Amino acid sequence: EDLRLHLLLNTSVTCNDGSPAGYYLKESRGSRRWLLFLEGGWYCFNRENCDSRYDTMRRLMSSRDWPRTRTGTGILSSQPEENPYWWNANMVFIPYCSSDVWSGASSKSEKNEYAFMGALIIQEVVRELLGRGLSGAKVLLLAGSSAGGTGVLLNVDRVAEQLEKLGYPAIQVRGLADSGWFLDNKQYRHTDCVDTITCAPTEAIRRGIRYWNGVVPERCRRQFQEGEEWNCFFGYKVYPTLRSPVFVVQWLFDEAQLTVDNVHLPVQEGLRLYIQNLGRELRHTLKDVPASFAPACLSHEIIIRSHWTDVQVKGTSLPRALHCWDRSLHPLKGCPVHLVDSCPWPHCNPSCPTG
Ligand SMILES: OCc1cn(-c2ccc(Cl)c(C(F)(F)F)c2Cl)nn1
Numbered sequence: 001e002d003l004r005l006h007l008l009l010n011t012s013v014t015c016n017d018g019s020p021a022g023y024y025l026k027e028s029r030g031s032r033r034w035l036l037f038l039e040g041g042w043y044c045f046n047r048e049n050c051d052s053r054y055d056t057m058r059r060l061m062s063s064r065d066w067p068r069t070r071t072g073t074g075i076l077s078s079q080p081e082e083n084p085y086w087w088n089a090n091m092v093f094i095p096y097c098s099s100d101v102w103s104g105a106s107s108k109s110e111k112n113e114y115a116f117m118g119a120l121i122i123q124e125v126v127r128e129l130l131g132r133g134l135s136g137a138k139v140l141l142l143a144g145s146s147a148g149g150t151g152v153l154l155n156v157d158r159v160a161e162q163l164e165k166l167g168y169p170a171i172q173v174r175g176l177a178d179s180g181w182f183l184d185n186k187q188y189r190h191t192d193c194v195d196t197i198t199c200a201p202t203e204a205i206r207r208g209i210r211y212w213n214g215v216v217p218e219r220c221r222r223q224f225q226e227g228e229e230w231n232c233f234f235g236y237k238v239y240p241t242l243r244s245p246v247f248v249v250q251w252l253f254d255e256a257q258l259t260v261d262n263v264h265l266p267v268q269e270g271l272r273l274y275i276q277n278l279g280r281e282l283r284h285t286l287k288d289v290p291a292s293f294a295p296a297c298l299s300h301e302i303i304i305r306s307h308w309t310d311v312q313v314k315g316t317s318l319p320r321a322l323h324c325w326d327r328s329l330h331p332l333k334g335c336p337v338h339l340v341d342s343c344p345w346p347h348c349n350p351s352c353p354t355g
């Protein structure tokens, strides 16, 4: 459909297996708005777990089998009916093929079976798009879901710094992090981290950064310092260090959070209290995030789904909140930007995704 594949002209910037990374683009000739969306999909943090991902999730590690087009959906749709927010924007979908939460800066070599180049992929996509119209942009919104949402937090200020150093200080860089705001909390039941899905969130990231040669935003790196940069993968810790405006979308009971917490859904008191405390902790971390949308749902659904318009918090949808955010970056009467549910159990918001 609407978005056409371009493999990176710089073939040194590669997916895990050394195949070229790339991006899907649909231009909107009149528009000075650019949406660059980072795909998600977990990660892998050692040879054995990356080898397994290569066998059964190869599109997340290689471009060799990518289709020449993709259909833009949700926030990437060009139909105003599906995307009330930014339907006329230039649309870019950046496939996630680095398995590194978009943090890596390491090539495949004689010492490395895999390349982890997520941070360099973003930089190279931006560089190559400048010749295709991005040089004329007024706003570059770097968005992403799941691992791509965390990728927004890790990379939005680097994109801003890149554009400034390349001589484009007028492009306003902003971030939209969907489902990438995690807690480094205690698991409901202990597991010994061997697989990526149920590994505790803290140890997963500590192993990953070393394997990927992962990079984090400079101000956050200066706070936590050497050996402790894993802290910067956690939204509530990295967000206060960022300078670009960032809108945070996060379900209060995110399914990936529950997975790494070893929760698998009648609920008895201990698990009831665990889940309720998780939602309260998430809500607490968003108290001082002025642009946020945090519904009280158990979900893995993301902003590129076609029915993303349906969820509301306090009667405001996400496309409306994002429009209000745009207005705020020029409070607004009846145009809120901070929308965090206060009810304490999944689906206490009636507009939660049905499943
Ligand atoms: O597609 C699901 C998914 C989730 N994530 C992820 C990204 C960053 C972080 Cl810091 C974490 C966490 F919680 F473990 F720490 C996770 Cl689960 N990546 N992909």
Ligand SMILES: *[C@@H]1O[C@H](CO)[C@@H](O)[C@H](O)[C@H]1NC(C)=O
Binding pocket: 010, 012, 013, 120, 124
């Ligand atoms: C290709 O990408 C690498 C890694 O980001 C970079 O060092 C190099 O300068 C790039 N080459 C060109 C011609 O842009």
